[PDB]
Symmetry: D3
Subunit: 240 residues, 6 copies
């Protein structure tokens, strides 16, 4: 759910704190001192997206407004923690995604830029979009539509276009682009349907469909729609 | 003119700050309190490249010395702005490249390293080269020869070699490498001629010529010279 | 020998500091004021991994305990220095790898995480794994087994799986992944043997053998064992 | 009224920013981007009381829970702002006490510590009392009872004891101590009545009455009750 | 004694952390994560004295060297903690002097400057003496000889001269100077003997004796030797 | 000459750096990397005055503007340096006032606020005045008229009124106030003529003349004019 992902997170944090004295202050600052997942998540992102021109204090306020003006955002964060947890068997702790995984952080920071975008506060959405790219090395245009249960593993170098759509339970690895072919304007980015898995370095270009539960091979260049439950691979990509 | 670009930037920022209270101090610190593009660019790069050992205040002095010794560096920055603008229908504001795009930032920072390199202040050149890599995720060798009207779109993972040449109006997407095959010294990096557009993740290796206005497809490995206006794609690349 | 590398680095530093006044305090803070390489390295890594939640002062004490429980980690560092040095004719000074190259840094930082992993201090190793990802854009799982004389050139986008092995004298470029094909647990990552060189963007997936002195061509996708001294290239890769 | 004061301050801010481009960002971050006085006051205070161990972001959440449990601390601030402005002919703008006067900052900070203390959250009240001393050079025991319309002019070196009382519209200059004589416990500090003005350097020791509207001359040491509207001066002091 | 004071401090910290979640990180960072009192003290001082040109990381290494080469400093720290605890009735906890009191902090910082002075590393001693004056508003020349059991209560504006001597169990309040009359060189500062209590604002000028257990009245100017167990007062000071 | 004071400062700095490796970075950032006193001083003051809202990089540009418009200001700094050099036999290095004495730092910082005040940039003058009070614990109204050859020894707690006049070669100790009696406006502060020396804690109130080369005793309250070369002591002060 959400309140109980929070509780499991709080309960792990106390243990983790007990077993690692060099990291207690860290567990207290990021999780233990907060009352809800929102307080913690905002504290983390604001600190991580912070810089000398726009300090953490100035960014937290901005994040907490979006959390109050749209609490679903936090729920979507909770569904993401669960996703990474259940889809990356190397992850056992519920707190791990929240504390350490930059992909997860970029996803949740993007949700905030999307909210701002839909509120027409574009210069602020752009500022964050790009600071997200600096901190996490993930560039998601605020206008993309991204569901929940999302996992951006390792994440470095992922780029997502303005008109891209990413449905629920999608997993994307490092270096993939959901970009364009060349049509400078209009619907021109991929529509990645549910359950899709995208291999490291894959380039998906155009306003084309990636059928649900498809698998996209590492480094493939996907230029044509992909049938559901199929595997595409190669350069350019073909079903195999 | 550089001066007109500045005038447009200032105008935009006055209205941008009107429309967004949360971000007004930002527009003010980055643009409105400055009297020309150089003071602004130096404030922006200094801050973005700053870190605990070499802070903003220490870096700005170096950048400002460079702009004063070679004024035209600012000129190329303004020509790169127009470029992104003209080449990206997504970018309506002149201020955007300047304030937010890490690729733009990486290029301008490189120009400073290039001036330092040509003046044989190479350790400083290497310092900045690498801090550009840390902050923007772009690694451009100071010896690289880069013209203007350039666009590093998204930019993450762009690596450019010591003997590479990039002439005007070139466009490079994330993940591309202009590198070598393994001759360890001498002229061994690409020659990207005017108007060339390089797709996301392309690897162009060797002292080979990439022809003006030629197009390189995503994830293509280019090991052979590409004719002007031609399109190269595949791994290895072939003329399509 | 370490003491000798250290000695070369110090004499280079006094020289460097004299020729570039603007960087003198830098050479003193990072090299001259320390009495051995671990002092320099720790100060350098602490400062680069520092963030507002865990400051340099806290990180340094963790790094220094590691260097005390295992002085050889510092020895592997001098070894990596020698390697970048003679495996790239563009690096001439011994101080260069230590002071500037994020690949070098990510690797020595990973060594600390690896020692933490074997001390069963995983929350800490995980924290650092991911800060290294944020700071240098290199994501190496603490459990990976890596030798010395290692070169991570440019480094941006390198991801190394939990069960990966990277023997001595290997060179890896930007964008390469050492990952899995989808077996969720158990041995599932690459065993890269000695002397191997991996080109830009290659993705090597699966618990497969990459024979000593093998060479992987850029953007390749290696899914089958690669013979010793063989060259592989393509999507998917073929012994070439 | 607080909203009145808030209004004049916002108004001054817009004009202040307009008249000094170099400080516009400061005006926007401290006053303009906030919707009320507590928001601005919490930002100014968290920022100024910040330190490497407890940064602004951590302190502002604390100041804000206090403003929420006891909104009347904010009113008192407004009232204190009216006082400096109207007892200091040299302060013409409402925004001045709020933005620049450490005496004013010290007082509103103590107020937070007072609330905490009565909430029996003493370690937190003590942490703040002492950071207030470090930042503003005013040391005020949290248990002290301090009214409104108070002016701590210049403020440097003011010290207020645990059992002290300071009623409304009192003025206190730099270097004054409201302390004790040596009775180590119990009511043992000055009762400073309304409208009382204390000149620079005076030491007022013991559980004694300082009469309503009395005046203490500089450097006097007051060890005996002071009649209302009377002037005391000398070492020791005597009614003059 | 040192190890016992340290355990009581560790014991209170664990308790204080449980009772104030908002401050737990602070208690772990300042106390709990350290193995001894010297590791905690150094963390505190390095952080408090820190500034943008000489960061905490750099100061800590300098303080730890001193504690390594002369361990008694920490012991004198424990003895001071004890002092404030038996001499200020308004101070229950052992952890308080160590965690919040700037006079305590100033004193411990001076001990490091006195050590460096005695090792003739005078630039380092002067840098700190002055940074101690900036952070705690206490200016103690490194050459003064100060014993233990010392209590600088409130402390703002305390100034101690080059040849001053302060013996064990002395108490000094805010604003006092142990200074000179004007002989520009030689022995020229007060010799404050054991058990002396100096009231707020007193100025003790000259190389005169302040007899053991003497009491100096607030704001007094002491220009002549003071008899033991006597009480001096006035400007200029005379007995009782 | 200012240039000779500079050459001497550089000279000492080069040797100080040789002798103290822990502070070499400091000598280099503060002195050796600059080309004139202006550069060093602006760098020093910008860092000392920086805070989270108004960073070092933002303040230096303010100071450098001031130095470029009234170069005489730097000349006044060199004069204040020599003054501390021989009026304080404890100080023999020309670099000491410059690098470590906060009273010097405050005087020089005041000069910048005075230039700003006389240019009607009063909000900027007020921001600095008070940041000077927080940084150095010295509060000097920007309008006060101060000459050169000044020395504020220790300096803590010095407060100087709006109409105060301080001519050349004056010496002021900690805790002294040049303040008013209560006439709320007009000419209401002391006129301190040349060579005057003021003891610690003295309070001089009202528009009264302190005659050249007069001497003021510690803790005095001067309420009546002081003849040239006279000595005044007491509460109130009498002529001695």
């Amino acid at each position: 759910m959400t309140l109980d992902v929070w509780q499991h997170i709080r309960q792990e944090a106390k243990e983790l704190a007990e077993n690692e004295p060099m990291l207690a202050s860290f567990f207290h600052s990021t999780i233990l001192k907060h009352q809800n997942l929102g307080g913690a998540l905002s504290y983390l992102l604001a600190n991580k997206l912070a810089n000398p021109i726009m300090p953490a204090i100035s960014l937290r306020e901005i994040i907490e407004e979006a959390y109050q003006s749209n609490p679903s955002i936090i729920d979507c964060a909770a569904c993401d923690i669960q996703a990474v947890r259940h889809r990356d068997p190397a992850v056992e702790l519920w707190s791990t995604p929240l504390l350490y995984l930059k992909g997860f952080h970029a996803i949740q920071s993007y949700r905030i830029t999307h909210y701002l975008w839909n509120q027409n506060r574009k210069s602020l959405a752009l500022y964050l979009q790009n600071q997200i790219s600096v901190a996490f090395d993930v560039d998601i245009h605020p206008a993309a539509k991204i569901g929940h249960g999302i996992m951006f593993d390792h994440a470095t170098g992922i780029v997502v276009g303005e008109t891209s759509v990413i449905e629920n339970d999608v997993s994307i690895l490092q270096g993939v682009t959901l970009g364009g072919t060349g049509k400078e304007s209009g619907d021109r980015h991929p529509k990645v349907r549910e359950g899709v898995m995208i291999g490291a370095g894959a380039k998906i270009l155009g306003n084309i469909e990636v059928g649900k539960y498809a698998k996209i091979g590492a480094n493939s260049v996907v230029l044509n729609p992909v049938p559901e439950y199929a595997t595409a691979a190669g350069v350019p990509a073909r079903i195999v």
